[PDB]
Amino acid sequence: GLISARVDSHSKILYARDVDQRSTTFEKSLLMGKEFQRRAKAMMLRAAVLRNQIHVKSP
Amino acid sequence: FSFKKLLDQCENQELEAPGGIATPPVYGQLLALYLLHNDMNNARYLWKRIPPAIKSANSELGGIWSVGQRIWQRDFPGIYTTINAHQWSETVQPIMEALRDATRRRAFALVSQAYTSIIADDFAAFVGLPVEEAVKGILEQGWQADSTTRMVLPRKPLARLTDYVAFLE
Amino acid sequence: SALEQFVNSVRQLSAQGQMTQLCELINKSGELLAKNLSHLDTVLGALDVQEHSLGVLAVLFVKFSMPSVPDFETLFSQVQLFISTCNGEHIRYATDTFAGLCHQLTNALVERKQPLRGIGILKQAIDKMQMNTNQLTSIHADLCQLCLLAKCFKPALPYLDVDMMDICKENGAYDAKHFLCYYYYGGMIYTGLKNFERALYFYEQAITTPAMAVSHIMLESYKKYILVSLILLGKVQQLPKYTSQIVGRFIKPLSNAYHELAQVYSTNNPSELRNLVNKHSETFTRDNNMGLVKQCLSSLYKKNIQRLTKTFLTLSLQDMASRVQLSGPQEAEKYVLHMIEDGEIFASINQKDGMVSFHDNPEKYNNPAMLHNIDQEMLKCIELDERLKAMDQEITVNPQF
Amino acid sequence: LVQCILDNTIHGRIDQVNQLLELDHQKRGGARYTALDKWTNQLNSLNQAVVSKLA
Amino acid sequence: RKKDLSAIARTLQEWCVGCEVVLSGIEEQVSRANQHKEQQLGLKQQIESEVAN
């Protein structure tokens, strides 16, 4: 929920936090780029074996 | 380093021709490039494929392997106490000292970032240099001294948004 | 009498048109081949030792006995001399006996003792079988197997780091178990080097394989998939929907202890996971993955210390020892220091007051560093698109009738 | 002040301990769009991936 | 401001060429992009046309 903060529990004091949307959106977009690259490796090797339509067959 | 090419040519001499036959200086270059890398995962596979004869014959490398276990487990006074007990014939032993200096400066740059405060006696035992030599080194590179705490405070020494909007935005 | 003729028929096709008759010549060979082949190998390197030597050496390894008396070393060196500077050009058509030769060399070195040099020679064969951006040849598995036995993963990485497209068959020369072994052994190679990202990727790709029957390679890769996903991520990563039905029907309830391990991992209790690891310890040692489950225990401790950043800012070491269950502030300080060094947590240690101060701010995204990071990631996406353009063109060419 | 917040008048945060108020004097609804475009592209990726990756 | 004349005109040559080269790098980025747009859409349309039969 709605507690956006860091508590200095060295001092045991709450400190409310504005999570920066610039940091948030750049973070999720570049993590989307990292998942884009993992799905890149996924689709490259997966289609290099299965655009062939060749698999671990019955024998 | 050049031990990469040395290891490649010694594996041309060891992993190509001889019979499944083992060779100890090739294995010395192997544990040299597994302790410079500190790749004790693959140096475990080394230690699985080192013969116990070569564990007993290339055995200055065995003391090197023990000291590298103390490095991997980060047993720092046991590291710097056991410097001159192993001396293998110029494959690992000079770069044992070079790796000691690399790990010295590595612990230096590591504590410089990862510590708001370290015990300087630990850190001197972590780098092998003594305590006031570590004081001279941190005044050389720029940490914050904190007397009477004995906790020296470590310290590390346009078209931008155009490209950022152009790809990520 | 007949063996003296075939050599003359090899030179007839040399520097000429088709070599399909030479493929038929290797297909027939001689059936009950004699020792004389060795003598025929004395005068055989006329042009570049030719494809005749491949048939000779393949038959020498097909023998099921000897293979070249206790002097097999000489034969090994001959095989080396056939792979190194001899190579060949029409290996693409003779792939069946070439991969077969590499498989037999691998199986012989596995049955014998130390297969260290075998890796060094094999990587050349692989280098001459593949095209440019690399193809998934069968020998790729063998290499991995060899470097998994002879504990030296360092030179096998360049063939593992590339996400190669299209599996090389040509005249058969490929089996599903070689695919499964390459991704399973490769997964174990990345797990041994503590590169859990590519390891998890490799195990995932080993499970996704279409299957009608359950193989032990798939079972072990699934178990190790759960373990690496518990280490790398906080929980078990979902396998794709295109995974085989036999995985959810047969492999899932067989590796019940691993899903039980994930079930106890989800409760965030280390003592209970310890109890469960002691409970099925015999089953984990039976699969020969005891060690990765210990890493799972340590990763659970690290997950519990990482959960503290979301709620606390400044926390006492004794409080951390009480919450994470470590006993004493000394072990808490050890764990926090290790986690800062490995880049797992963003925190600082205050010894005077005995406190831990969590920061949680690696970047503000104004460095050039990010500029270079984004430039490299964009170049990867551009590569994929030119790769994707090539795949799409290949598919457009060919269309159905 | 809190009452003013109810008003939706105050745009800024208040440090209760420090007893001070920071207002978002310079506002920016500039920030979202980069992320939004990114998200739109993400869906684009979704439509593209599901079809392509799918047999 | 008695002669900076030489240095004056040569600083002029400098900055003139600087904006010139900025704009010329732009020029060839243009000879890339929508020349790349020509090639890309031409090939994509080739694909779409070959989709039929």
Side-chain angles (χ1 to χ4, degrees), chain E residues 26-48:
Chain E
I26 304 159
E27 297 173 353
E28 298 306 329
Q29 296 291 317
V30 171
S31 178
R32 296 170 59 252
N34 283 316
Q35 185 73 43
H36 175 75
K37 184 264 184 181
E38 300 172 355
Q39 189 64 41
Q40 170 59 41
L41 277 177
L43 301 176
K44 187 173 178 65
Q45 295 165 355
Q46 297 172 358
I47 301 167
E48 298 174 353

PDB file of all heavy atoms in Angstrom, chain E residues 26-48:
ATOM      1  N   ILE E  26      24.263  15.507 -39.640  1.00  0.00           N
ATOM      2  CA  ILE E  26      22.812  15.420 -39.783  1.00  0.00           C
ATOM      3  C   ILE E  26      22.433  14.993 -41.194  1.00  0.00           C
ATOM      4  O   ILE E  26      21.544  14.156 -41.393  1.00  0.00           O
ATOM      5  CB  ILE E  26      22.183  16.775 -39.449  1.00  0.00           C
ATOM      6  CG1 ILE E  26      22.602  17.217 -38.063  1.00  0.00           C
ATOM      7  CG2 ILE E  26      20.683  16.690 -39.552  1.00  0.00           C
ATOM      8  CD1 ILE E  26      22.439  18.657 -37.921  1.00  0.00           C
ATOM      9  N   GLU E  27      23.072  15.608 -42.192  1.00  0.00           N
ATOM     10  CA  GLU E  27      22.797  15.322 -43.597  1.00  0.00           C
ATOM     11  C   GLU E  27      22.927  13.839 -43.886  1.00  0.00           C
ATOM     12  O   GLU E  27      22.065  13.231 -44.529  1.00  0.00           O
ATOM     13  CB  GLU E  27      23.771  16.105 -44.476  1.00  0.00           C
ATOM     14  CG  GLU E  27      23.653  17.605 -44.376  1.00  0.00           C
ATOM     15  CD  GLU E  27      24.750  18.313 -45.140  1.00  0.00           C
ATOM     16  OE1 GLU E  27      25.670  17.626 -45.633  1.00  0.00           O
ATOM     17  OE2 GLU E  27      24.698  19.556 -45.241  1.00  0.00           O
ATOM     18  N   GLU E  28      24.014  13.241 -43.430  1.00  0.00           N
ATOM     19  CA  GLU E  28      24.224  11.832 -43.719  1.00  0.00           C
ATOM     20  C   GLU E  28      23.426  10.921 -42.798  1.00  0.00           C
ATOM     21  O   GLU E  28      23.084   9.807 -43.196  1.00  0.00           O
ATOM     22  CB  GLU E  28      25.712  11.502 -43.678  1.00  0.00           C
ATOM     23  CG  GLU E  28      26.455  12.279 -44.743  1.00  0.00           C
ATOM     24  CD  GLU E  28      25.846  12.075 -46.121  1.00  0.00           C
ATOM     25  OE1 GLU E  28      25.299  10.983 -46.382  1.00  0.00           O
ATOM     26  OE2 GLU E  28      25.898  13.019 -46.938  1.00  0.00           O
ATOM     27  N   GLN E  29      23.072  11.375 -41.594  1.00  0.00           N
ATOM     28  CA  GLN E  29      22.052  10.668 -40.832  1.00  0.00           C
ATOM     29  C   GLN E  29      20.721  10.654 -41.567  1.00  0.00           C
ATOM     30  O   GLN E  29      19.938   9.715 -41.407  1.00  0.00           O
ATOM     31  CB  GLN E  29      21.891  11.311 -39.458  1.00  0.00           C
ATOM     32  CG  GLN E  29      23.133  11.201 -38.614  1.00  0.00           C
ATOM     33  CD  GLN E  29      23.407   9.784 -38.175  1.00  0.00           C
ATOM     34  OE1 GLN E  29      22.498   9.062 -37.773  1.00  0.00           O
ATOM     35  NE2 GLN E  29      24.662   9.369 -38.266  1.00  0.00           N
ATOM     36  N   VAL E  30      20.467  11.667 -42.392  1.00  0.00           N
ATOM     37  CA  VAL E  30      19.258  11.757 -43.203  1.00  0.00           C
ATOM     38  C   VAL E  30      19.381  10.823 -44.398  1.00  0.00           C
ATOM     39  O   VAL E  30      18.435  10.113 -44.754  1.00  0.00           O
ATOM     40  CB  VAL E  30      19.032  13.204 -43.670  1.00  0.00           C
ATOM     41  CG1 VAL E  30      17.917  13.262 -44.688  1.00  0.00           C
ATOM     42  CG2 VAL E  30      18.731  14.100 -42.487  1.00  0.00           C
ATOM     43  N   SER E  31      20.565  10.811 -45.009  1.00  0.00           N
ATOM     44  CA  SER E  31      20.868   9.849 -46.061  1.00  0.00           C
ATOM     45  C   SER E  31      20.829   8.421 -45.537  1.00  0.00           C
ATOM     46  O   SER E  31      20.825   7.474 -46.325  1.00  0.00           O
ATOM     47  CB  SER E  31      22.235  10.146 -46.673  1.00  0.00           C
ATOM     48  OG  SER E  31      22.557   9.192 -47.668  1.00  0.00           O
ATOM     49  N   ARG E  32      20.944   8.259 -44.221  1.00  0.00           N
ATOM     50  CA  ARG E  32      20.628   6.997 -43.570  1.00  0.00           C
ATOM     51  C   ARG E  32      19.126   6.782 -43.446  1.00  0.00           C
ATOM     52  O   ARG E  32      18.538   5.981 -44.181  1.00  0.00           O
ATOM     53  CB  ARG E  32      21.257   6.984 -42.182  1.00  0.00           C
ATOM     54  CG  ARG E  32      22.762   7.021 -42.170  1.00  0.00           C
ATOM     55  CD  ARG E  32      23.242   7.246 -40.754  1.00  0.00           C
ATOM     56  NE  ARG E  32      22.767   6.193 -39.866  1.00  0.00           N
ATOM     57  CZ  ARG E  32      21.827   6.372 -38.945  1.00  0.00           C
ATOM     58  NH1 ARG E  32      21.267   7.564 -38.795  1.00  0.00           N
ATOM     59  NH2 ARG E  32      21.445   5.362 -38.178  1.00  0.00           N
ATOM     60  N   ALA E  33      18.487   7.541 -42.554  1.00  0.00           N
ATOM     61  CA  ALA E  33      17.193   7.224 -41.957  1.00  0.00           C
ATOM     62  C   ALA E  33      16.071   7.034 -42.964  1.00  0.00           C
ATOM     63  O   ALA E  33      15.516   5.938 -43.082  1.00  0.00           O
ATOM     64  CB  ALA E  33      16.797   8.321 -40.967  1.00  0.00           C
ATOM     65  N   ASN E  34      15.721   8.089 -43.688  1.00  0.00           N
ATOM     66  CA  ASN E  34      14.611   7.972 -44.619  1.00  0.00           C
ATOM     67  C   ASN E  34      15.059   7.503 -45.988  1.00  0.00           C
ATOM     68  O   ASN E  34      14.211   7.212 -46.836  1.00  0.00           O
ATOM     69  CB  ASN E  34      13.860   9.300 -44.711  1.00  0.00           C
ATOM     70  CG  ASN E  34      12.959   9.524 -43.517  1.00  0.00           C
ATOM     71  OD1 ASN E  34      12.256   8.613 -43.090  1.00  0.00           O
ATOM     72  ND2 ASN E  34      12.977  10.731 -42.969  1.00  0.00           N
ATOM     73  N   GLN E  35      16.367   7.412 -46.213  1.00  0.00           N
ATOM     74  CA  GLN E  35      16.881   6.470 -47.194  1.00  0.00           C
ATOM     75  C   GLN E  35      16.733   5.051 -46.663  1.00  0.00           C
ATOM     76  O   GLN E  35      16.323   4.130 -47.386  1.00  0.00           O
ATOM     77  CB  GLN E  35      18.340   6.793 -47.487  1.00  0.00           C
ATOM     78  CG  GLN E  35      18.981   5.976 -48.573  1.00  0.00           C
ATOM     79  CD  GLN E  35      18.490   6.377 -49.937  1.00  0.00           C
ATOM     80  OE1 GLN E  35      18.353   7.564 -50.233  1.00  0.00           O
ATOM     81  NE2 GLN E  35      18.208   5.392 -50.779  1.00  0.00           N
ATOM     82  N   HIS E  36      17.048   4.861 -45.380  1.00  0.00           N
ATOM     83  CA  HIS E  36      16.702   3.618 -44.712  1.00  0.00           C
ATOM     84  C   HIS E  36      15.198   3.419 -44.703  1.00  0.00           C
ATOM     85  O   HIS E  36      14.726   2.285 -44.760  1.00  0.00           O
ATOM     86  CB  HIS E  36      17.210   3.559 -43.277  1.00  0.00           C
ATOM     87  CG  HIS E  36      16.752   2.334 -42.559  1.00  0.00           C
ATOM     88  ND1 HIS E  36      17.290   1.090 -42.802  1.00  0.00           N
ATOM     89  CD2 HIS E  36      15.752   2.145 -41.669  1.00  0.00           C
ATOM     90  CE1 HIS E  36      16.670   0.191 -42.059  1.00  0.00           C
ATOM     91  NE2 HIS E  36      15.729   0.805 -41.367  1.00  0.00           N
ATOM     92  N   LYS E  37      14.429   4.501 -44.632  1.00  0.00           N
ATOM     93  CA  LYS E  37      12.985   4.379 -44.732  1.00  0.00           C
ATOM     94  C   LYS E  37      12.575   3.899 -46.111  1.00  0.00           C
ATOM     95  O   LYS E  37      11.696   3.036 -46.227  1.00  0.00           O
ATOM     96  CB  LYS E  37      12.318   5.714 -44.418  1.00  0.00           C
ATOM     97  CG  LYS E  37      10.817   5.671 -44.402  1.00  0.00           C
ATOM     98  CD  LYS E  37      10.238   6.110 -45.732  1.00  0.00           C
ATOM     99  CE  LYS E  37       8.724   6.154 -45.683  1.00  0.00           C
ATOM    100  NZ  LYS E  37       8.134   6.566 -46.984  1.00  0.00           N
ATOM    101  N   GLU E  38      13.257   4.377 -47.149  1.00  0.00           N
ATOM    102  CA  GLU E  38      12.999   3.886 -48.492  1.00  0.00           C
ATOM    103  C   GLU E  38      13.251   2.394 -48.577  1.00  0.00           C
ATOM    104  O   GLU E  38      12.368   1.636 -48.990  1.00  0.00           O
ATOM    105  CB  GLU E  38      13.907   4.611 -49.480  1.00  0.00           C
ATOM    106  CG  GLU E  38      13.717   6.106 -49.517  1.00  0.00           C
ATOM    107  CD  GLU E  38      14.765   6.786 -50.366  1.00  0.00           C
ATOM    108  OE1 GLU E  38      15.687   6.088 -50.833  1.00  0.00           O
ATOM    109  OE2 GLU E  38      14.678   8.018 -50.553  1.00  0.00           O
ATOM    110  N   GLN E  39      14.435   1.959 -48.148  1.00  0.00           N
ATOM    111  CA  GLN E  39      14.789   0.547 -48.237  1.00  0.00           C
ATOM    112  C   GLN E  39      13.863  -0.312 -47.382  1.00  0.00           C
ATOM    113  O   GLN E  39      13.365  -1.348 -47.831  1.00  0.00           O
ATOM    114  CB  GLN E  39      16.246   0.343 -47.830  1.00  0.00           C
ATOM    115  CG  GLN E  39      16.733  -1.062 -48.101  1.00  0.00           C
ATOM    116  CD  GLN E  39      16.739  -1.379 -49.584  1.00  0.00           C
ATOM    117  OE1 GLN E  39      17.110  -0.543 -50.405  1.00  0.00           O
ATOM    118  NE2 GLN E  39      16.323  -2.589 -49.934  1.00  0.00           N
ATOM    119  N   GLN E  40      13.652   0.095 -46.130  1.00  0.00           N
ATOM    120  CA  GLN E  40      12.816  -0.658 -45.204  1.00  0.00           C
ATOM    121  C   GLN E  40      11.405  -0.833 -45.737  1.00  0.00           C
ATOM    122  O   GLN E  40      10.896  -1.953 -45.800  1.00  0.00           O
ATOM    123  CB  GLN E  40      12.792   0.018 -43.838  1.00  0.00           C
ATOM    124  CG  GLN E  40      11.751  -0.576 -42.906  1.00  0.00           C
ATOM    125  CD  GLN E  40      11.957  -2.042 -42.657  1.00  0.00           C
ATOM    126  OE1 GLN E  40      13.083  -2.499 -42.476  1.00  0.00           O
ATOM    127  NE2 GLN E  40      10.867  -2.799 -42.656  1.00  0.00           N
ATOM    128  N   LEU E  41      10.729   0.266 -46.070  1.00  0.00           N
ATOM    129  CA  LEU E  41       9.379   0.095 -46.583  1.00  0.00           C
ATOM    130  C   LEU E  41       9.350  -0.612 -47.925  1.00  0.00           C
ATOM    131  O   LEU E  41       8.430  -1.393 -48.163  1.00  0.00           O
ATOM    132  CB  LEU E  41       8.651   1.429 -46.677  1.00  0.00           C
ATOM    133  CG  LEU E  41       8.065   1.816 -45.325  1.00  0.00           C
ATOM    134  CD1 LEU E  41       7.411   3.175 -45.386  1.00  0.00           C
ATOM    135  CD2 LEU E  41       7.066   0.750 -44.902  1.00  0.00           C
ATOM    136  N   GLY E  42      10.327  -0.384 -48.803  1.00  0.00           N
ATOM    137  CA  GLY E  42      10.359  -1.133 -50.046  1.00  0.00           C
ATOM    138  C   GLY E  42      10.435  -2.626 -49.809  1.00  0.00           C
ATOM    139  O   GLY E  42       9.676  -3.397 -50.396  1.00  0.00           O
ATOM    140  N   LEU E  43      11.307  -3.046 -48.897  1.00  0.00           N
ATOM    141  CA  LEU E  43      11.466  -4.466 -48.616  1.00  0.00           C
ATOM    142  C   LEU E  43      10.254  -5.021 -47.879  1.00  0.00           C
ATOM    143  O   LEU E  43       9.825  -6.152 -48.134  1.00  0.00           O
ATOM    144  CB  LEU E  43      12.736  -4.679 -47.802  1.00  0.00           C
ATOM    145  CG  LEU E  43      13.996  -4.179 -48.507  1.00  0.00           C
ATOM    146  CD1 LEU E  43      15.208  -4.326 -47.605  1.00  0.00           C
ATOM    147  CD2 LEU E  43      14.199  -4.900 -49.828  1.00  0.00           C
ATOM    148  N   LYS E  44       9.698  -4.243 -46.954  1.00  0.00           N
ATOM    149  CA  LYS E  44       8.517  -4.673 -46.220  1.00  0.00           C
ATOM    150  C   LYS E  44       7.334  -4.847 -47.161  1.00  0.00           C
ATOM    151  O   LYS E  44       6.539  -5.784 -47.021  1.00  0.00           O
ATOM    152  CB  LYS E  44       8.213  -3.649 -45.129  1.00  0.00           C
ATOM    153  CG  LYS E  44       7.116  -4.035 -44.176  1.00  0.00           C
ATOM    154  CD  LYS E  44       7.033  -3.024 -43.050  1.00  0.00           C
ATOM    155  CE  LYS E  44       5.900  -3.357 -42.108  1.00  0.00           C
ATOM    156  NZ  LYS E  44       6.156  -4.649 -41.414  1.00  0.00           N
ATOM    157  N   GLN E  45       7.228  -3.966 -48.151  1.00  0.00           N
ATOM    158  CA  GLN E  45       6.189  -4.075 -49.161  1.00  0.00           C
ATOM    159  C   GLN E  45       6.450  -5.250 -50.089  1.00  0.00           C
ATOM    160  O   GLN E  45       5.509  -5.897 -50.556  1.00  0.00           O
ATOM    161  CB  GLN E  45       6.125  -2.770 -49.941  1.00  0.00           C
ATOM    162  CG  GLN E  45       5.688  -1.603 -49.092  1.00  0.00           C
ATOM    163  CD  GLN E  45       5.961  -0.281 -49.763  1.00  0.00           C
ATOM    164  OE1 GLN E  45       6.569  -0.232 -50.831  1.00  0.00           O
ATOM    165  NE2 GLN E  45       5.529   0.803 -49.133  1.00  0.00           N
ATOM    166  N   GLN E  46       7.722  -5.528 -50.380  1.00  0.00           N
ATOM    167  CA  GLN E  46       8.065  -6.747 -51.102  1.00  0.00           C
ATOM    168  C   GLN E  46       7.565  -7.972 -50.351  1.00  0.00           C
ATOM    169  O   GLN E  46       6.979  -8.886 -50.944  1.00  0.00           O
ATOM    170  CB  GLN E  46       9.579  -6.827 -51.282  1.00  0.00           C
ATOM    171  CG  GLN E  46      10.169  -5.708 -52.106  1.00  0.00           C
ATOM    172  CD  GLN E  46      11.682  -5.725 -52.098  1.00  0.00           C
ATOM    173  OE1 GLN E  46      12.299  -6.567 -51.445  1.00  0.00           O
ATOM    174  NE2 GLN E  46      12.290  -4.782 -52.805  1.00  0.00           N
ATOM    175  N   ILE E  47       7.788  -7.992 -49.037  1.00  0.00           N
ATOM    176  CA  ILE E  47       7.303  -9.077 -48.188  1.00  0.00           C
ATOM    177  C   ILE E  47       5.791  -9.191 -48.292  1.00  0.00           C
ATOM    178  O   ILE E  47       5.238 -10.280 -48.489  1.00  0.00           O
ATOM    179  CB  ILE E  47       7.734  -8.838 -46.731  1.00  0.00           C
ATOM    180  CG1 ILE E  47       9.255  -8.758 -46.623  1.00  0.00           C
ATOM    181  CG2 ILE E  47       7.168  -9.925 -45.826  1.00  0.00           C
ATOM    182  CD1 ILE E  47       9.732  -8.218 -45.294  1.00  0.00           C
ATOM    183  N   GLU E  48       5.104  -8.060 -48.145  1.00  0.00           N
ATOM    184  CA  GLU E  48       3.647  -8.062 -48.147  1.00  0.00           C
ATOM    185  C   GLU E  48       3.100  -8.524 -49.493  1.00  0.00           C
ATOM    186  O   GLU E  48       2.093  -9.240 -49.552  1.00  0.00           O
ATOM    187  CB  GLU E  48       3.147  -6.663 -47.800  1.00  0.00           C
ATOM    188  CG  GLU E  48       3.571  -6.213 -46.411  1.00  0.00           C
ATOM    189  CD  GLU E  48       3.194  -4.778 -46.118  1.00  0.00           C
ATOM    190  OE1 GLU E  48       2.715  -4.088 -47.040  1.00  0.00           O
ATOM    191  OE2 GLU E  48       3.386  -4.338 -44.966  1.00  0.00           O
TER     192      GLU E  48
END
